[model samples]
Target: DDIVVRQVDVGETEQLMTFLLAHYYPEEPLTAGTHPPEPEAADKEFLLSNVPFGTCFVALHEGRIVAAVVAGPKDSHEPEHMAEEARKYAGGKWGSILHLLSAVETATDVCRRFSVPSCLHVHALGVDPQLRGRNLGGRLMETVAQRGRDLGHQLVSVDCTSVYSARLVQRLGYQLINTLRYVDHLDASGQQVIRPPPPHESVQTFVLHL
Candidate 1:
């Protein structure tokens, strides 16, 4: 239990690359395509290159990265950038719109639905699957929530599955905000996958107040 949480510098891009591909991306397999987002040379470099905007943090066990969180301030994207990203991917217009609106609607619902103020837009969080049961996720999350509080953020938020990730967030003091269901069209086997809704569910939003 000698793990240490450090403010990783850009020199550790390679470590960040490994953690995102190995831990974060695989756990939420519906993001980039039906087969989970891949951290190729370009993807890794992009994530590695951008860590200073309060968006990238990593954890270490004996000087090796084991976990990380990719966070960002709210509304950092423009409609054109989103539209261009949509055009670059094969999901077509609807998928692009969904990706764009997912944030918009989630943010709106968080404030209006819950009658709360600003929400932290958490882009990613994952623990090493090999390190499961060690409660490292809890430590990374406490750091996140504290950072949110330090920034005067009123709500800490993320979207996750019904599995361990949601439980981790809840353990760190987040509550279930709502469930969003969408048909994952690019599933590996070419099946139209339903992201489970609550009750019959497998995924939902988790939120904690700072």
Candidate 2:
């Protein structure tokens, strides 16, 4: 196996955006409303900021992006602020999708609930569609936990927007922080942001203590 896992440097953050939509967004269930999850300006800022803390990773097969993760430091109190940031997309294409994550994040507040000041939060994670069954996702997360250990951190959190995504890390010894049903999260207009569907009906948060 030529797939190698390592941290994505700060200078490469911009390149991650291209990899995200092309691979991850298209397959996620909660983002199905917009179906393309086009993060507006504010969303980009919030998402891109995670890389610089040096916790992100990429799985390369032959030096190409086969799978990637964007994870970094986040405090317990940041979810409300994140929700506020989500509002900036309220009138745009990915508003509801953005709000879905913010809604779940605000509800879970995993770090505070776990009694930690801050932890590594996995903002985005995806593997190549054609390369799915190889367990690249697990390898990426094991690397994340090791990175967390290296940084002298105690907790690592992941907001899983799909049921399949949720299951991958559950067996890796991560604790279930909270779950938010798609039917339960609604926009201001009382419209469901994510359509409840087979294989994915909820969004869940999980935390691992390193």
Candidate 3:
């Protein structure tokens, strides 16, 4: 019982980034494909900026952030905001991955499908790699499901770029809403834009009705 799950309070962005940089970015399927995922200032803001909205959570073990769940709203204007961010990410390290994510997000469009005003869309779930096999990710997702509903979010959504993540969310009661093969997602030239390696070949969308 040494682990405790809680919402990441304001002023914890620094520690939050420390955990993500070390455990999440370096090991996530999409980013790990690069030599080392180069993190820019905007990359930092992109995730942590959503924390103050009070949808982010952390699991502390040994008084440190060993796992995290960062979420945001699925409002009507996300497509435009995502487009703006896509422009910013053009010359940056995360554009390709974000491209795939946004496409998947649009394809799923959980908010539109469910006809909700604004829903909680989980942006990322990062578990300390070394501490992984012990079900920490499961617990964190459970917290997200309950806390999201507690906050009056009627729908919770996620995009899984990795197989492990897909399985985790599936086990956590998130329904498999859709899947897009990376090889099939092509650009104007009809060539694949992002070819995530085996077992990471597809990005899946999952939703939990709260």
Candidate 4:
């Protein structure tokens, strides 16, 4: 079977959500909640809504969307403002951990401090379970970077929520800018908020200049 990578259509939004929920989000620590439950759909449509047309890449295997890479322009706001927007988007609860919130603020601050405009932010990437070992995820990411370059994005950033994705981006030449380990984040009980789970060990920020 051949794999085709192309831009996602507006009509494919439902398929995108379905794929993320079934194959991507469930494996994440933020969804299960370490202590307090987070808004499952937080930042869900926000990224999809803002991406420039044809930036969201989908991997099709035999005519079905089996994998996807969601990338888009960095929100034109200060780091603090971006974090505030996330807080509001998640309804004041961005999961049991502040990994997502921290990642957003950090990425924004780094880009702004360096005056890197026209940045393409990689929000999420997922591969279908049936095709796990085929390197579809990496291919999708490559296509994203290729598309980003054609679009004139100066830099590409990813707030890696899972260790798996973090490692993937690192393998793809993204430099590690910052990291927040699960064991280091303690809740009210002075216990680690995110248990040391396999596949999702920490939230890491990585970037590549396009």
Q: How well does model 3 score by local distance difference test?
A: 0.76
Candidate 2 residue runs with Cα over 4 Å from true position: 35-45, 196-198
Q: What are the models' TM-scores?
A: 0.71, 0.87, 0.89, 0.81
* lDDT measured at residue 60 in model 2 versus the true structure, 0 to 100: 85
Candidate 3 on 1-210: residue-level lDDT in tens? 778888887777889988888877765666754333566666668888888878888988888788988887667667666766766675445776666666776677766777887778888888877785567888877887787777888988887877678888888778888888877887556756675456677778888888
lDDT of 2 by residue, 1-210 (tens): 668887888788666777877787667675555644544555556667777788889998888888988887888768877777677667565666668877877888877787887888888888887886778889999988898898888898888877667888888988887888888877788977777347676678888888
The local lDDT score (0 to 100) that residue 5 gets in candidate 1 is 81
**Candidate 4 per-residue C-alpha lDDT over 1-210 given as tens digits, one digit per residue, 9 for 90 to 100:** 488888887776888777777776666566554444433454466556744467898888888889988877764464666656645543334534354555445544656755777677776787887987778988988888888889788788877887678778889999987777666666556755556356566677788887
Candidate 3 wrong stretches, greater than 4 Å: 33-36, 132-134
By lDDT, who's the top model here? 2
User: How big is the positional error of residue 97 in model 1, measured in Å on the Cα after superposition?
Assistant: 9.9
- State the local distance difference test value for candidate 2: 0.78
User: For each candidate, C-alpha RMSD in Å?
Assistant: 5.2, 2.3, 2.1, 3.2
Model 1 agreement with the true structure over 2-34: per-residue lDDT tens digits: 777866566666667667777776545444433
Clashes of each: 0, 0, 0, 0
**Candidate rank order under TM-score:** 3, 2, 4, 1
**What's the CA error at residue 176 for candidate 4, in Å?**
0.7
lDDT of 1: 0.60
Higher-lDDT candidate of 1 and 3: 3
In model 2, the number of clashes is 0
